[PDB]
Design a protein around this motif. Structure first.
Motif, PDB file in Angstrom:
ATOM      1  N   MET A  37       2.251  -1.633  11.322  1.00 35.50           N
ATOM      2  CA  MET A  37       2.244  -2.540  10.054  1.00 35.50           C
ATOM      3  C   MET A  37       3.493  -1.707   9.043  1.00 35.50           C
ATOM      4  SD  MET A  37      -0.899  -3.524   7.511  1.00 35.50           S
ATOM      5  CE  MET A  37      -1.845  -4.138   8.936  1.00 35.50           C
ATOM      6  N   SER A  38       4.142  -2.561   8.601  1.00 36.34           N
ATOM      7  CA  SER A  38       5.145  -2.356   7.564  1.00 36.34           C
ATOM      8  C   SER A  38       4.544  -2.526   5.962  1.00 36.34           C
ATOM      9  CB  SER A  38       6.558  -3.058   7.671  1.00 36.34           C
ATOM     10  OG  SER A  38       6.001  -4.558   7.604  1.00 36.34           O
ATOM     11  N   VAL A  39       5.102  -1.796   5.046  1.00 40.57           N
ATOM     12  CA  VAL A  39       4.837  -2.081   3.809  1.00 40.57           C
ATOM     13  C   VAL A  39       5.213  -3.509   3.299  1.00 40.57           C
ATOM     14  CG1 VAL A  39       5.182  -1.272   1.237  1.00 40.57           C
ATOM     15  CG2 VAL A  39       5.534   0.523   3.255  1.00 40.57           C
ATOM     16  N   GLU A  40       6.171  -4.112   3.803  1.00 38.67           N
ATOM     17  CA  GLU A  40       6.698  -5.386   3.470  1.00 38.67           C
ATOM     18  C   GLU A  40       5.622  -6.392   4.095  1.00 38.67           C
ATOM     19  OE1 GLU A  40       9.574  -7.653   6.283  1.00 38.67           O
ATOM     20  OE2 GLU A  40      10.686  -7.494   4.712  1.00 38.67           O
ATOM     21  N   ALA A  41       5.004  -6.218   5.251  1.00 34.07           N
ATOM     22  CA  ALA A  41       3.959  -7.036   5.694  1.00 34.07           C
ATOM     23  C   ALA A  41       2.779  -7.091   4.813  1.00 34.07           C
ATOM     24  CB  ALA A  41       3.704  -6.593   6.914  1.00 34.07           C
ATOM     25  N   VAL A  42       2.279  -5.888   4.363  1.00 38.98           N
ATOM     26  CA  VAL A  42       1.131  -5.887   3.444  1.00 38.98           C
ATOM     27  C   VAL A  42       1.175  -6.647   2.138  1.00 38.98           C
ATOM     28  CG1 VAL A  42       1.505  -3.538   2.551  1.00 38.98           C
ATOM     29  CG2 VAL A  42      -0.812  -4.521   2.746  1.00 38.98           C
ATOM     30  N   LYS A  43       2.428  -6.362   1.571  1.00 42.94           N
ATOM     31  CA  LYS A  43       2.785  -7.031   0.250  1.00 42.94           C
ATOM     32  C   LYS A  43       2.588  -8.478   0.280  1.00 42.94           C
ATOM     33  CE  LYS A  43       3.828  -3.102  -2.032  1.00 42.94           C
ATOM     34  NZ  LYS A  43       4.969  -2.850  -2.281  1.00 42.94           N
ATOM     35  N   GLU A  44       3.370  -8.874   0.927  1.00 47.11           N
ATOM     36  CA  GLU A  44       3.546 -10.646   1.091  1.00 47.11           C
ATOM     37  C   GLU A  44       2.245 -11.276   1.519  1.00 47.11           C
ATOM     38  OE1 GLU A  44       7.619 -10.833   2.901  1.00 47.11           O
ATOM     39  OE2 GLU A  44       7.491 -12.895   1.941  1.00 47.11           O
ATOM     40  N   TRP A  47       0.269 -11.189  -1.240  1.00 48.74           N
ATOM     41  CA  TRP A  47       1.256 -12.127  -2.281  1.00 48.74           C
ATOM     42  C   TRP A  47       0.949 -13.636  -1.959  1.00 48.74           C
ATOM     43  CZ3 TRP A  47       5.486 -15.350  -1.494  1.00 48.74           C
ATOM     44  CH2 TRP A  47       6.292 -15.763  -2.713  1.00 48.74           C
ATOM     45  N   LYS A  48       0.693 -14.049  -0.888  1.00 47.85           N
ATOM     46  CA  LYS A  48       0.740 -15.498  -0.276  1.00 47.85           C
ATOM     47  C   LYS A  48      -0.749 -15.982  -0.770  1.00 47.85           C
ATOM     48  CE  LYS A  48      -0.031 -16.528   3.917  1.00 47.85           C
ATOM     49  NZ  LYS A  48       0.203 -16.949   5.291  1.00 47.85           N
ATOM     50  N   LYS A  49      -1.817 -14.820  -0.575  1.00 52.52           N
ATOM     51  CA  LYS A  49      -2.980 -15.050  -0.691  1.00 52.52           C
ATOM     52  C   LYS A  49      -3.602 -15.296  -2.288  1.00 52.52           C
ATOM     53  CE  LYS A  49      -5.550 -12.655   1.942  1.00 52.52           C
ATOM     54  NZ  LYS A  49      -5.851 -13.363   2.937  1.00 52.52           N
ATOM     55  N   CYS A  50      -3.057 -14.448  -3.246  1.00 54.63           N
ATOM     56  CA  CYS A  50      -3.589 -14.307  -4.411  1.00 54.63           C
ATOM     57  C   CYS A  50      -2.593 -15.096  -5.357  1.00 54.63           C
ATOM     58  CB  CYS A  50      -3.860 -12.955  -4.857  1.00 54.63           C
ATOM     59  SG  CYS A  50      -4.949 -11.839  -3.902  1.00 54.63           S
ATOM     60  N   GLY A  51      -1.217 -14.874  -4.908  1.00 53.06           N
ATOM     61  CA  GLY A  51      -0.288 -15.444  -5.785  1.00 53.06           C
ATOM     62  C   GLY A  51      -0.215 -14.727  -7.162  1.00 53.06           C
ATOM     63  N   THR A  52       0.228 -13.389  -6.941  1.00 54.06           N
ATOM     64  CA  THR A  52       0.310 -12.384  -8.161  1.00 54.06           C
ATOM     65  C   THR A  52       1.368 -11.384  -7.880  1.00 54.06           C
ATOM     66  OG1 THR A  52      -0.694 -10.976  -9.727  1.00 54.06           O
ATOM     67  CG2 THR A  52      -1.491 -11.190  -7.332  1.00 54.06           C
ATOM     68  N   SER A  53       1.943 -10.890  -8.806  1.00 59.08           N
ATOM     69  CA  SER A  53       2.812  -9.746  -8.740  1.00 59.08           C
ATOM     70  C   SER A  53       2.275  -8.369  -8.702  1.00 59.08           C
ATOM     71  CB  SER A  53       3.950  -9.759  -9.879  1.00 59.08           C
ATOM     72  OG  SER A  53       3.054 -10.093 -11.130  1.00 59.08           O
ATOM     73  N   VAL A  54       2.454  -7.636  -7.513  1.00 58.42           N
ATOM     74  CA  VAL A  54       1.827  -6.417  -7.469  1.00 58.42           C
ATOM     75  C   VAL A  54       2.891  -5.140  -7.875  1.00 58.42           C
ATOM     76  CG1 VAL A  54       0.295  -7.094  -5.433  1.00 58.42           C
ATOM     77  CG2 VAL A  54       2.738  -6.519  -5.248  1.00 58.42           C
ATOM     78  N   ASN A  55       3.415  -5.601  -8.869  1.00 55.61           N
ATOM     79  CA  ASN A  55       4.333  -4.672  -9.657  1.00 55.61           C
ATOM     80  C   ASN A  55       3.514  -3.607 -10.469  1.00 55.61           C
ATOM     81  OD1 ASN A  55       7.278  -4.252 -10.760  1.00 55.61           O
ATOM     82  ND2 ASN A  55       6.072  -3.923 -12.341  1.00 55.61           N
ATOM     83  N   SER A  56       2.274  -3.913 -11.044  1.00 58.97           N
ATOM     84  CA  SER A  56       1.666  -2.930 -11.772  1.00 58.97           C
ATOM     85  C   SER A  56       0.793  -2.152 -11.108  1.00 58.97           C
ATOM     86  CB  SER A  56       1.061  -3.681 -12.925  1.00 58.97           C
ATOM     87  OG  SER A  56       0.669  -4.840 -12.459  1.00 58.97           O
ATOM     88  N   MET A  57       0.827  -2.316  -9.598  1.00 59.38           N
ATOM     89  CA  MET A  57       0.020  -1.712  -8.790  1.00 59.38           C
ATOM     90  C   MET A  57       1.002  -0.490  -7.958  1.00 59.38           C
ATOM     91  SD  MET A  57      -2.886  -2.867  -6.202  1.00 59.38           S
ATOM     92  CE  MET A  57      -3.666  -3.774  -7.595  1.00 59.38           C
ATOM     93  N   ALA A  58       1.084   0.502  -8.141  1.00 69.12           N
ATOM     94  CA  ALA A  58       2.123   1.488  -7.379  1.00 69.12           C
ATOM     95  C   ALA A  58       1.293   2.510  -6.367  1.00 69.12           C
ATOM     96  CB  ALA A  58       2.788   2.480  -8.435  1.00 69.12           C
ATOM     97  N   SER A  76       9.986  -0.327   6.394  1.00 67.97           N
ATOM     98  CA  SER A  76      10.299  -1.229   7.421  1.00 67.97           C
ATOM     99  C   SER A  76      10.359  -0.101   8.785  1.00 67.97           C
ATOM    100  CB  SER A  76      11.662  -2.003   7.292  1.00 67.97           C
ATOM    101  OG  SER A  76      12.665  -0.773   6.526  1.00 67.97           O
ATOM    102  N   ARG A  77       9.680   0.950   8.482  1.00 70.53           N
ATOM    103  CA  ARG A  77       9.351   1.954   9.786  1.00 70.53           C
ATOM    104  C   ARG A  77       7.889   2.261   9.944  1.00 70.53           C
ATOM    105  NH1 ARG A  77      14.848   4.262  10.074  1.00 70.53           N
ATOM    106  NH2 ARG A  77      14.112   4.840  11.894  1.00 70.53           N
ATOM    107  N   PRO A  78       7.525   2.089  11.208  1.00 69.30           N
ATOM    108  CA  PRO A  78       6.389   2.343  11.816  1.00 69.30           C
ATOM    109  C   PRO A  78       5.779   3.771  11.381  1.00 69.30           C
ATOM    110  CG  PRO A  78       7.981   2.393  13.571  1.00 69.30           C
ATOM    111  CD  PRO A  78       8.611   2.022  12.406  1.00 69.30           C
ATOM    112  N   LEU A  79       4.743   3.780  10.438  1.00 75.66           N
ATOM    113  CA  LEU A  79       4.369   5.131  10.192  1.00 75.66           C
ATOM    114  C   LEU A  79       4.121   6.098  10.970  1.00 75.66           C
ATOM    115  CD1 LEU A  79       1.841   3.530   7.070  1.00 75.66           C
ATOM    116  CD2 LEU A  79       4.511   4.372   7.095  1.00 75.66           C
ATOM    117  N   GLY A  80       3.328   5.652  12.343  1.00 78.29           N
ATOM    118  CA  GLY A  80       3.132   6.556  13.293  1.00 78.29           C
ATOM    119  C   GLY A  80       4.134   6.917  13.712  1.00 78.29           C
ATOM    120  N   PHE A  81       5.188   6.595  13.745  1.00 76.38           N
ATOM    121  CA  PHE A  81       6.581   6.805  14.567  1.00 76.38           C
ATOM    122  C   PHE A  81       7.341   7.784  13.538  1.00 76.38           C
ATOM    123  CE2 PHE A  81      10.827   6.076  16.188  1.00 76.38           C
ATOM    124  CZ  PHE A  81      10.684   6.265  17.744  1.00 76.38           C
TER     125      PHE A  81
END
Length: 97
Positions: A37-44, A47-58, A76-81
Motif C-alpha cells: 500500500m502506497s501513501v498515495e493510496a491511503v490519502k485519496e 479524501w474521496k470518503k470524507c471530502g476534506t484536506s488532510v494537510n493539518s494531519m502530518a 510510491s514505494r512498497p514499504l516492505g521492499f
C-alpha cells in the motif's frame, strides 16, 4: 471464563505499523497493513470518503533510532521492499483538533 486460542497457519505479508495519535499519551494500535500500500493510496482513499484536506494531519514516520525515515520518496514505494522493520513508528501530528 476461559481463553480462546485459534492458530490458523497463514504466512501473510503485512507490517505492524504502530499508529499513535498525538491526542493520546499512548495509543497502542499496531495494525496489520499489507506493505504494498502506497501513501498515495491511503490519502485519496480517505479524501474521496470524507471530502476534506488532510494537510493539518502530518505523519511523523520515525525509526527505532529516533529519526524521521519518511523522505516522501516512499510515497510510491512498497514499504516492505524498502526497509526491513517489523513495525514503524507512526506518530500522527494531528494539529486539527
Amino acid at each position: 471464563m476461559g481463553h480462546h486460542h485459534h492458530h490458523h497457519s497463514h504466512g501473510d505479508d503485512s507490517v505492524h505499523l504502530h499508529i499513535t495519535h498525538a491526542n493520546l499519551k499512548s495509543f497502542s494500535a499496531d495494525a496489520r497493513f499489507s506493505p504494498q500500500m502506497s501513501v498515495e493510496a491511503v490519502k485519496e482513499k480517505l479524501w474521496k470518503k470524507c471530502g476534506t484536506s488532510v494537510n493539518s494531519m502530518a505523519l511523523e514516520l520515525y525509526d527505532d533510532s529516533g529519526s524521521k525515515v519518511a523522505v516522501l520518496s516512499d510515497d510510491s514505494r512498497p514499504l516492505g521492499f524498502f526497509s526491513p522493520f517489523d513495525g514503524f513508528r507512526l506518530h500522527i501530528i494531528d494539529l486539527d483538533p
